[PDB]
Design an enzyme around this catalytic site. Structure first.
Site, mmCIF file in Angstrom:
data_model
loop_
_atom_site.group_PDB
_atom_site.id
_atom_site.type_symbol
_atom_site.label_atom_id
_atom_site.label_comp_id
_atom_site.label_asym_id
_atom_site.label_seq_id
_atom_site.Cartn_x
_atom_site.Cartn_y
_atom_site.Cartn_z
ATOM 1 N N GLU A 69 10.445 60.400 27.450
ATOM 2 C CA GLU A 69 9.552 61.369 27.216
ATOM 3 C C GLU A 69 7.949 60.970 26.718
ATOM 4 O OE1 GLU A 69 8.879 65.743 25.679
ATOM 5 O OE2 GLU A 69 10.799 65.486 26.746
ATOM 6 N N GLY A 70 7.157 61.373 27.433
ATOM 7 C CA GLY A 70 5.959 60.445 26.854
ATOM 8 C C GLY A 70 4.865 61.870 26.482
ATOM 9 N N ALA A 71 3.870 60.774 26.443
ATOM 10 C CA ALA A 71 3.589 62.627 25.769
ATOM 11 C C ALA A 71 2.358 63.259 26.855
ATOM 12 C CB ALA A 71 1.578 62.188 25.441
ATOM 13 N N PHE A 72 2.659 62.837 28.540
ATOM 14 C CA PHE A 72 2.077 63.555 29.566
ATOM 15 C C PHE A 72 2.952 63.663 30.852
ATOM 16 C CE2 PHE A 72 -0.997 60.542 27.837
ATOM 17 C CZ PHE A 72 -1.583 61.307 27.115
ATOM 18 N N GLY A 73 4.588 62.765 30.849
ATOM 19 C CA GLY A 73 5.471 62.784 31.582
ATOM 20 C C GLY A 73 6.496 62.558 30.990
ATOM 21 N N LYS A 74 8.063 62.965 31.949
ATOM 22 C CA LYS A 74 8.864 63.151 31.557
ATOM 23 C C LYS A 74 9.590 61.946 31.973
ATOM 24 C CE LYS A 74 9.020 67.675 30.227
ATOM 25 N NZ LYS A 74 10.112 69.442 30.008
ATOM 26 N N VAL A 75 10.888 61.249 31.920
ATOM 27 C CA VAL A 75 11.883 60.551 32.495
ATOM 28 C C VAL A 75 13.585 61.056 32.941
ATOM 29 C CG1 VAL A 75 12.288 58.560 33.673
ATOM 30 C CG2 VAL A 75 10.632 58.149 32.608
ATOM 31 N N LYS A 109 10.250 60.392 37.588
ATOM 32 C CA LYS A 109 9.185 60.656 36.609
ATOM 33 C C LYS A 109 8.217 62.087 36.663
ATOM 34 C CE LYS A 109 4.951 59.490 35.180
ATOM 35 N NZ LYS A 109 4.127 59.159 34.409
ATOM 36 N N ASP A 142 -2.589 45.772 29.464
ATOM 37 C CA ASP A 142 -1.034 46.540 28.221
ATOM 38 C C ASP A 142 0.323 45.776 28.533
ATOM 39 O OD1 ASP A 142 0.371 47.376 26.415
ATOM 40 O OD2 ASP A 142 -0.374 49.756 27.279
ATOM 41 N N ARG A 162 7.543 46.103 25.196
ATOM 42 C CA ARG A 162 7.906 47.587 25.460
ATOM 43 C C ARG A 162 7.660 47.621 26.930
ATOM 44 N NH1 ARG A 162 3.566 46.090 22.606
ATOM 45 N NH2 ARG A 162 1.240 47.490 23.028
ATOM 46 N N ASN A 163 6.371 47.517 27.733
ATOM 47 C CA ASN A 163 6.291 47.801 28.653
ATOM 48 C C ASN A 163 6.741 46.670 30.192
ATOM 49 O OD1 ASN A 163 4.191 49.461 28.094
ATOM 50 N ND2 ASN A 163 2.920 47.641 27.830
ATOM 51 N N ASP A 184 4.471 49.558 33.612
ATOM 52 C CA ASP A 184 3.353 50.188 32.675
ATOM 53 C C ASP A 184 3.156 51.100 32.378
ATOM 54 O OD1 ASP A 184 1.237 50.240 31.061
ATOM 55 O OD2 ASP A 184 -0.189 49.841 32.481
HETATM 56 C C1 LIG Z 1 -3.586 52.079 34.833
HETATM 57 C C2 LIG Z 1 -2.009 52.167 35.066
HETATM 58 C C3 LIG Z 1 -1.005 51.206 35.181
HETATM 59 N N1 LIG Z 1 -0.627 51.350 36.727
HETATM 60 C C4 LIG Z 1 0.676 51.347 36.245
HETATM 61 C C5 LIG Z 1 1.647 51.685 36.034
HETATM 62 C C6 LIG Z 1 3.139 51.293 35.975
HETATM 63 N N2 LIG Z 1 4.399 52.594 36.113
HETATM 64 C C7 LIG Z 1 5.531 52.152 35.193
HETATM 65 O O1 LIG Z 1 5.123 50.971 35.110
HETATM 66 C C8 LIG Z 1 6.173 53.467 35.569
HETATM 67 C C9 LIG Z 1 5.968 54.157 34.462
HETATM 68 C C10 LIG Z 1 7.077 55.867 34.017
HETATM 69 C C11 LIG Z 1 8.473 55.196 33.951
HETATM 70 C C12 LIG Z 1 9.190 53.781 34.677
HETATM 71 C C13 LIG Z 1 7.618 52.850 35.045
HETATM 72 C C14 LIG Z 1 8.683 51.652 35.066
HETATM 73 C C15 LIG Z 1 9.755 53.772 34.449
HETATM 74 C C16 LIG Z 1 11.343 53.589 34.246
HETATM 75 C C17 LIG Z 1 12.463 53.248 33.943
HETATM 76 C C18 LIG Z 1 14.013 52.607 34.895
HETATM 77 N N3 LIG Z 1 14.969 53.344 34.552
HETATM 78 C C19 LIG Z 1 14.458 52.905 33.168
HETATM 79 C C20 LIG Z 1 15.857 53.715 31.839
HETATM 80 C C21 LIG Z 1 14.782 54.449 30.981
HETATM 81 C C22 LIG Z 1 13.736 54.319 31.131
HETATM 82 N N4 LIG Z 1 13.000 54.284 31.626
HETATM 83 N N5 LIG Z 1 13.571 54.262 32.945
HETATM 84 N N6 LIG Z 1 12.928 55.560 29.896
HETATM 85 C C23 LIG Z 1 12.264 56.330 30.103
HETATM 86 C C24 LIG Z 1 11.200 56.285 30.026
HETATM 87 C C25 LIG Z 1 9.861 57.006 28.914
HETATM 88 O O2 LIG Z 1 9.807 57.109 27.628
HETATM 89 N N7 LIG Z 1 8.707 57.557 29.351
HETATM 90 C C26 LIG Z 1 7.540 57.321 29.862
HETATM 91 C C27 LIG Z 1 7.250 57.824 31.597
HETATM 92 C C28 LIG Z 1 5.472 58.514 31.820
HETATM 93 C C29 LIG Z 1 5.137 56.430 32.422
HETATM 94 O O3 LIG Z 1 6.126 57.239 33.463
HETATM 95 C C30 LIG Z 1 3.480 50.549 36.513
HETATM 96 C C31 LIG Z 1 2.509 49.275 37.059
HETATM 97 C C32 LIG Z 1 3.116 48.165 37.209
HETATM 98 F F1 LIG Z 1 2.660 46.880 36.279
HETATM 99 F F2 LIG Z 1 4.011 47.466 37.687
HETATM 100 F F3 LIG Z 1 2.669 47.410 37.688
HETATM 101 C C33 LIG Z 1 1.013 49.612 36.854
HETATM 102 C C34 LIG Z 1 -0.664 51.979 36.857
HETATM 103 N N8 LIG Z 1 -2.722 52.668 36.691
#
Ligand SMILES: Cc1cn(-c2cc(NC(=O)c3cc4cc(c3C)C#Cc3cnc5ccc(nn35)NCCC(=O)NCCCCO4)cc(C(F)(F)F)c2)cn1
Length: 290
Positions: free
Chosen positions: A19-25, A42, A145, A149-150, A163
């Protein structure tokens, strides 16, 4: 869109992952997707928020690589808006590193050795992340970033870059809050980012060196001894990180190549990848003398 869509009836939520500040998974099942399977979707604490949604989604569909977290599509039919990601069994890379070294007493399961991660596995992890950064540098996408952790880890020890998300929450030790509406991973940032507020692909190379550091110290925070302000001071004034002790001199030589003060004086991420990849696939005999 220009974005793949998934019907809600194909998605069955099982339970929450994080769970994030704005999103759940949620961990969920997804039918008629491939060629049935488990996915991580998510949900969004919508507020405005419906704009950044179809922005991140379009970007993730463009970023398709063997070392970037797969994105299967979205579900916009009704609320809440969903993003279907592939499921990574071992969670984020930082939690994986901390739970496998140096104790680690047995402690290994289906994909990982009993004790601490071997030099060959550490190099294998670093190589995969570098390979992902080469792709992003090839598209001139700046991460801003880059940290363990990412990065996510899947079955067969597959490391992939992503991310979060989660990062801003309960990993707040890794961020310095400024202005009240913005946090900064200053321990991962190069001097020209902290001072001049400038982020480039060369700034990611600095970040990777710090990520490359993390790996060989099993998830331990950079400048752990220092506070937020003190960390800024050392990075600004030009202090470098330690190497002990899982890191061979040959590998620490790669970190420093990422930690040059001048961004143009740093090595390319393609170069760092080349050295890390060779060391990864190198024979035991060569690695035992490192
Ligand atoms: C500025 C900007 C950045 N990006 C950008 C964004 C992105 N997105 C992302 O990496 C992203 C975002 C996201 C969730 C997930 C990912 C991968 C995931 C996942 C996943 C898969 N198996 C598991 C098992 C446990 C968990 N997660 N998980 N823990 C739960 C996480 C939590 O507890 N809170 C997470 C919930 C909220 C997040 O939502 C990837 C990239 C890129 F790097 F791939 F390009 C770039 C786009 N615009």
């Amino acid at each position: 869109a220009c974005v793949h869509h998934i019907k809600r009836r194909d998605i069955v939520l099982k339970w929450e992952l994080g769970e994030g500040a704005f999103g759940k998974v949620f961990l969920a099942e997804c039918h008629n997707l491939l060629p049935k399977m488990l996915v991580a979707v998510k949900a969004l604490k919508e507020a405005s928020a419906r704009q950044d949604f179809q922005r991140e989604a379009e970007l993730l569909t463009m970023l398709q690589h063997q070392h970037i977290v797969r994105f299967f599509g979205v579900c916009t039919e009704g609320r809440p808006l969903l993003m279907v990601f592939e499921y990574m069994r071992h969670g984020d890379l930082n939690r994986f590193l901390r739970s496998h070294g140096p104790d680690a007493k047995l402690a290994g399961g289906e994909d990982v050795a009993p004790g601490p991660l071997g030099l060959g596995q550490l190099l294998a992890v670093a190589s995969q992340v570098a390979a992902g950064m080469v792709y992003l540098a090839g598209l001139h996408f700046v991460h801003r970033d880059l940290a363990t952790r990412n990065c996510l880890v899947g079955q067969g020890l597959v490391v992939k870059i992503g991310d979060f998300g989660m990062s801003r929450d309960i990993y707040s030790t890794d961020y310095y809050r400024v202005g009240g509406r913005t946090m900064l991973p200053i321990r991962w940032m190069p001097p020209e980012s902290i001072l001049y507020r400038k982020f480039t692909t060369e700034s990611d190379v600095w970040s990777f060196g710090v990520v490359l550091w993390e790996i060989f110290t099993y998830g331990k925070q950079p400048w752990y001894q220092l506070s937020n302000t003190e960390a800024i001071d050392c990075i600004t004034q030009g202090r470098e990180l330690e190497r002990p002790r899982a890191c061979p001199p040959e590998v620490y030589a790669i970190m420093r190549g990422c930690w040059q003060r001048e961004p143009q004086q740093r090595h390319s991420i393609k170069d760092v990848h080349a050295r890390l990849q060779a060391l990864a696939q190198a024979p035991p005999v060569y690695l035992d003398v490192l």
